[PDB]
Amino acid sequence: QSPALIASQSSWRCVQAHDREGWLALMADDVVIEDPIGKSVTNPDGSGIKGKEAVGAFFDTHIAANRLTVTCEETFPSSSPDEIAHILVLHSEFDGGFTSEVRGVFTYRVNKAGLITNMRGYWNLDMMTFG
Amino acid sequence: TTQSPALIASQSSWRCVQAHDREGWLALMADDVVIEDPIGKSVTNPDGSGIKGKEAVGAFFDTHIAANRLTVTCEETFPSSSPDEIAHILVLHSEFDGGFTSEVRGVFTYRVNKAGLITNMRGYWNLDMMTFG
Questions:
Q1: CA dihedral for A75, A71, A87, A52, sign (positive or negative)
Q2: Which CATH code fits B1-133?
Q3: Structural domain spans, chain A
Q4: CB contacts < 8 Å between A and B, how many?
Q5: Distance of alpha carbon A113 from alpha carbon B28, whole angstroms
Q6: Out of A36, A78, A84, whose CB is closest to B80?
Q7: CATH of domain A1-131
Q8: Counting Cβ atoms within 10 Å, is residue A117 exposed (0-12), middle (13-18) or buried (19+)?
Q9: Strand ranges, E, within chain A
Q10: Residues 6+ apart with CB under 8 A from B114
Q11: With contact defined as beta carbons under 8 Å apart, do A99 and A92 qualify?
Q12: Mind telling me how many Å the CA of B130 is from chain A's nearest CA?
């Protein structure tokens, strides 16, 4: 398995376990999270969350707090072991049985040591469902 | 019913490549355009850092597209929250003699600048994903 694939799949594991330390351990010091790409609540300046301290806070706020799960629909390797794209479905679960989802394209780049430098989400609110 | 700059640019670029329209395709590109089709080292990305700038992009069109009987099928589009970046799932289908063909299905991302011009086009596929018939 490629370094990009190992990292994407580890990241979902850690997001599902609320494993803050394990999740941050996957990230390069210069990691940029754009989930989604563009101005949103989870990308409030439209240019990404930069660096592990800020990415730790993002984790506390939008991940540690919620009941987030990841379903992987399809994986698209590139010709680089270090870059990969997936179709994923993000599941957030509320009290009383309520769930929101968003199905998007997520791209991951790692550096040469195998750490996440970029996580980029092609989705917006018109793609979110609630049930 | 107005489409984003990223969506206009990517539909126009499919149109131009299939029309074998090199100059209309190049007119869609920024001066600092980089095409990584695919991302990573490959026949169409020899050093794995993309085809950079409009002169090399025109040459890429002259070697790899002028040449072949290309159909792009857009299977699915994924807008982002930026009007300037978009992803699609595309099937790229090439026709060869004796009804022999190749196909690759992958993810393609596009980014445009403020002026609506393509700065980046990146494809997630490799030779082992390609199918022939």
A1: negative
A2: 3.10.450.50
A3: 1-131
A4: 89
A5: 36
A6: A36
A7: 3.10.450.50
A8: middle
A9: 27-34, 49-50, 69-77, 83-93, 99-110, 116-122, 128-130
A10: none
A11: yes
A12: 12
